[PDB]
Design a protein around this ligand. Structure first.
Ligand SMILES: Nc1ncnc2c1ncn2[C@@H]1O[C@H](COP(=O)(O)OP(=O)(O)O)[C@@H](O)[C@H]1O
Ligand SMILES: Nc1ncnc2c1ncn2[C@@H]1O[C@H](COP(=O)(O)OP(=O)(O)O)[C@@H](O)[C@H]1O
Lengths: 360, 360
């Protein structure tokens, strides 16, 4: 039984190990938190930090393939292990390119992938003048500040940053795309950010075809292995530009669990194990909605509105096992499937007001 | 957070456990095997046998609602607790009715539920005679013997058995049906036994309609709470008779996980928690096949044919993490979803020869 190593034992990692074991694989989770969510349901867990070079190395050498559910990781030791032959997917090199938002943009531009106009900042006040207000500023490494006036510019993000033209967004889109080392690619439906996800995106065939073609291009240019979450902007001028790349299963890909033949999590395992990719057929439209911790609440998690929300046909719930609720924190998500996406959304919005994660 | 107690740590209980925690419930599993499949992903496990009176008592009293994944359990102690007001679903009384095939037949007959003519054995030889050859003999509690003539009376089943008329079976059908304490019912599509399940059964719609009606009337008569597996016979003469009742999620219902909006396991949780039931809509036809350990293999499980099998579109694998394979033992199942049920069956049977659980 081949062993899959997973760095990061949070929710994304747990869902990963669950699908991996379901496919008959042994899983070792590396997380600093003893009995992490993923470690709890994994075969083994290495209790160490995401930069404990020594331990991440014990994971890689003790696994057939190593993957990860988060980006803030020791990419350096990973590149070394990758260079001497150990299987790490996605490649620590693509992770590196993605870590630094500027180099990610640079990479996308060079490979012919549409992206917002950007500019490395060396002379802040001098560079912003090349865009004029409003302009967008982002931190190169992990955030995003929208400079609209003088007072904001005087209080801009400090550190290594870069500028981006403020994009006139018609809609924000996303698409999961997986790829084998063999080269097979599986592209999912383009979805829409209403944080709520609408699948499929209510957009002209013309645009979804383009969004799918660009998402594939990115993974290809990257020679990626695993599943990737590509965020895009459909502009007010009819242009599709990629905003960011997530080298792992993405929150905007959860709908696949209830709406597609193979979930994003099953694809990721298939992809990193170089197995034949699974069908991405959308069996039914779906609207997903994150269950964030309520504003002004702290402590013991409490889910309210369950009975009433479950009465909505097509509604199902995914509550994560978290011991502490924090405002804005991702406590879970719920999805609504309906033959008619519009009815799916109406219901989801209705439920959104009902389902709340409170404290005590 | 409400607590759900589950007696039985096998694969069914594990699948129930996960779905339960997914809905935000706390789960405590009771199983005589330490680190049982279900206990490993539950919150707590009580190491104890299914007849350890005082231990199942701790489980029920420490839970808001208790259920089970098998029938061979201390039903009498549960009846005691149930009479004290503790929530146990399905009721120990229902479990009691189903555990004995004769009382079960007596019950169905008392409620007008279509069933084969039967008779309790007082004097084996004399009773079979007034029935005529051939006749079917069944143990009341523990399997089936067809008495073709006098000679067979010597090898007849010993103990307390009952007799029933021989039925000329055309097809064997199954249907999952869940019910709330509030009385809400949720009926699934009827499936066809090929051990491989075909969803939906390839039968004239007139039969499907009656099969779902018969099944629903069964759980209604029982005033059942939870999801039930209703096994029926479609005779050569166009009659639909109920043969068996399973008071729990059933193997013939695994298809729901891949082809229906809400799986039988989520449905079961909804029903025992008296919450609104989920949609049973069939999103796409499906064929499920059980994976059993191949003959002559013992020890650590090992799979063969995965790549060739996963190359088949719509094929997904569900390998249970059993710590040892053994001939004929259920190690998991795989499903093949396809818009065309005949292509699903074709693919499934083709893969049934490729996927195999062997020893390492
Ligand atoms: N170039 C841009 N022009 C206008 N709005 C933008 C631009 N880039 C990002 N945004 C907005 O800010 C949000 C943050 O985008 P993102 O780069 O993914 O930051 P984060 O790391 O929080 O996700 C987006 O949802 C989008 O609405
Ligand atoms: N009354 C009957 N007439 C003819 N065949 C029967 C009858 N009852 C059962 N059988 C056959 O025997 C098989 C198993 O009997 P069953 O009642 O399901 O016992 P069990 O499920 O515990 O093995 C059925 O699948 C069916 O093919």
């Amino acid at each position: 039984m081949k062993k899959i190593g997973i760095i990061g034992g949070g929710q994304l990692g747990k869902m990963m190990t669950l699908e991996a074991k379901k496919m008959g694989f042994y899983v070792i989770v590396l997380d600093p938190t003893p009995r992490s969510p993923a470690g709890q349901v994994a075969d083994e867990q290495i209790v160490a930090g995401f930069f404990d070079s020594e331990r991440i190395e014990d994971l890689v050498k003790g696994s057939d393939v190593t993957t990860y559910d988060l980006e803030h990781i020791d990419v350096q030791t990973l590149k070394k292990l990758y260079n001497e032959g150990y299987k790490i997917h996605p490649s620590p090199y693509t992770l590196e390119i993605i870590q630094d938002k500027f180099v990610q943009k640079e990479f996308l531009k060079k490979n012919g992938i549409p992206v917002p106009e950007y500019k490395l900042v060396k002379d802040l006040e001098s560079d912003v003048r090349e865009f004029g207000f409003p302009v967008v500023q982002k931190a190169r490494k992990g955030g995003v500040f929208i400079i609209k006036n003088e007072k904001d510019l005087e209080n801009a993000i400090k550190g290594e940053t870069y500028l981006e033209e403020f994009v006139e967004i018609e809609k924000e889109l996303a698409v999961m795309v997986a790829r084998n080392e063999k080269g097979e690619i599986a592209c999912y439906p383009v979805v829409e950010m209403y944080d709520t996800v609408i699948a499929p995106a209510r957009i002209e065939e013309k645009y979804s075809k383009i969004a799918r073609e660009i998402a594939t291009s990115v993974v290809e240019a990257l020679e990626g292995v695993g599943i990737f979450g590509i965020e895009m902007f459909l502009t007010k001028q009819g242009e599709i530009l990629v905003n960011e790349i997530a080298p792992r299963p993405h929150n905007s890909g959860h709908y696949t669990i209830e709406a597609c033949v193979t979930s994003q999590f099953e694809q990721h395992i298939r992809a990193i194990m170089n197995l034949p990719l699974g069908s991405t057929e959308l069996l039914i439209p779906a609207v997903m909605v994150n269950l964030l911790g309520e504003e002004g609440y702290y402590g013991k998690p409490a889910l309210i509105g369950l009975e009433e929300a479950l009465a909505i046909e097509g509604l199902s719930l995914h509550f994560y096992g978290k011991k502490e609720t924090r405002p804005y924190r991702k406590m879970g998500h719920f999805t609504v499937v309906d033959r008619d996406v519009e009815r799916a959304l109406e219901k989801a919005l209705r439920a959104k007001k009902i389902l709340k994660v409170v404290s005590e």
